[PDB]
Amino acid sequence: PGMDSLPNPYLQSVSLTVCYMVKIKANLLSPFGKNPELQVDFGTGTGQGGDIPFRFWYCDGIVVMNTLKDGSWGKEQKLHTEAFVPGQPFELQFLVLENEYQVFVNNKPICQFAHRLPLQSVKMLDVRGDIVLTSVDTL
Amino acid sequence: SLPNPYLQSVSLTVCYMVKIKANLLSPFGKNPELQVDFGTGTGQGGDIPFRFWYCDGIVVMNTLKDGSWGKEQKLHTEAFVPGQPFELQFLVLENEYQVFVNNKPICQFAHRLPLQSVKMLDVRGDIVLTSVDTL
């Protein structure tokens, strides 16, 4: 039952471009008394409560995506998906393009998020949740 | 630097990226050439779903199927500055390859043969090839 994994939360300084990929490989846990959550922040890396151009949040069949701008969360983009089967390992991909982030799970497109803050203002990638995180790669 | 030509077995997906970093040379007696094959890896004459070729301000893209090339997609670009390092990206999506040079969109190539049939990446030309990465 031993397996190598990365720290959780996982932090990585980044500079996004118009053709940029994040690939996360992880598996949802079975936490005591709650459904496991997954959360990925493309954040500005300022202080606490600093801007978050793009947060991706998943729990129990539901994806919520939003933007934190000057202490204010915006209008949620919310959807249902069956892509995350606990406790099957999954591959979660974010593709940063000029117009939007594109999200894939296990090579299938799940959803897209139009940029609300400039992608150039993202400085910090933050991956956390009730997960065993095995790898995070960027290109 | 890396061998030139460069070969790497690959398996593409609907969200797949190739990033090439190279210095374009200044050969006396010709204009420098750059060629990237997304090929089937099935012998010397096998199908090539996507060839990207660049020389002297012109990009040509095409597909080799059953021993003959298709109808070209040709266009002009100034993105390759002679003698300068460049970064060339290929993004493989469900519908097309998207090409970027130094973080700028250059051109797109709709799939003509299945991306799943590409098995071999081939990078060559009048270049110093410093890195090839995929994800």
Numbering used by the authors:
A (entry chain A): -1 to 137
B (entry chain E): 3 to 137
What does the paper say about this structure?
As a functional analogue of galectin-1, galectin-11 is proposed to cross-link glycans in mucus to form a physical barrier against the parasite(s), as part of a pronounced inflammatory response. The crystal structure of LGALS-11 has a folding pattern that is similar to prototype galectins-1, -2 and -10, suggesting a relatively conserved ligand-binding activity.
LGALS-11 forms a homodimer via hydrogen bonds between residues L9 and S11 of monomers (i), and is inferred to have two unique cell attachment sites (called LDV and RGD) for integrin binding (ii). The LGALS-11 crystal structure enabled the localisation of the precise residue variation in the dimer interface connecting β-strands of two monomers, the glycan-binding groove and the putative integrin-binding site. Through sedimentation velocity studies, we confirmed that the residue substitution in the dimer interface affects the homodimers and subsequent oligomerisation of LGALS-11. In addition, we demonstrated that only the homotetrameric form of LGALS-11 inhibits H. contortus larval development, and causes direct damage to the surface of the L4, an indication of loss of viability and death. No anti-parasitic activity was detected for isoform 2 or the dimerisation interface (DI-m) or carbohydrate recognition (CRD-m) mutant, indicating that extended oligomerisation or lattice formation via self-dimerisation and glycan recognition properties is critical for the anti-parasitic effect.
